Amino acid sequence: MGFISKERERALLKDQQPGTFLLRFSESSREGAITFTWVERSQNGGEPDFHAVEPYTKKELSAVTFPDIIRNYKVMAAENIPENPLKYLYPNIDKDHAFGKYYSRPTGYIKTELISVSE
Amino acid sequence: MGFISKERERALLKDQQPGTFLLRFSESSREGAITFTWVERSQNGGEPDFHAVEPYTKKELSAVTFPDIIRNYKVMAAENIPENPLKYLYPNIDKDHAFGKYYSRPTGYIKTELISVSE
């Protein structure tokens, strides 16, 4: 969607599964930086404070593609299994369908790949 | 340690805590690419198959610094807390000492990092 105001975004995420997420451009870049936004359940019986991510410039994207960021988003803790709070894109589309086709790929060194993680 | 043969490496890692690691430069790139090597306990009452990682070249290091790879190395699973097999550098030196001093740093956007991860 790229361009949308951080007002009519919230008011378009009072949709669905605590786990829908926009694609936005950031307005506060000078390098032009893409981002996403997603939504939870807060227990108060309503909308979340919602959630967005520090926007991904070329720097990061040089080193790993946008899709692949998403696939493997975490969020973490000290000693808790890590979440993946990304299920459905805009209306209802399973992550691993929209961006399926863009994923890269799927005595002996051990295989690493990069990963963006919060907290 | 840079330069060493993958013979007198193993035979100098029958030192210590299942959790020591050198630094090595890789012999098998042309691009020049550093790597690390570390050791476990296999339960058989001896040395591990040991472990070393796919070599980290410029590309990767462009994006996030080598030290910072170290700090936050993972290894993961489906639904298991993620480990940190790097504790002691060569003879006995706590990770968070050797490479302390190079670490970078320690409605409202949420802070992301990059991180290197296996499995």
Short recap of the structure:
Chain A is of the alpha+beta class and 119 residues long. In chain A, 13% of the residues lie in helices and 16% in strands. The longest helix of chain A is centred in the middle third of the chain and has 6 residues, at 58-63.
Structure in words:
The structure is cut from a larger assembly and holds two copies of chain A (about 120 residues). With about 120 residues, chain A is α+β, with helices and mostly antiparallel strands. Helices cover about 15% and strands about 15% of the residues of chain A. Chain A is built from three helices and four strands. In chain A, strands 1-2-3 form a three-stranded antiparallel sheet, with no helix packed on it. In chain A, a hairpin with an 8-residue loop joins strand 1 and strand 2. Chain A is globular and about 55 Å long. The interface between A and B is medium-sized, with 28 and 30 residues. The PDB classes it as immune system. The entry lists the keywords innate immunity, immune system. The entry is titled "A tetrameric STAT1-DNA complex".
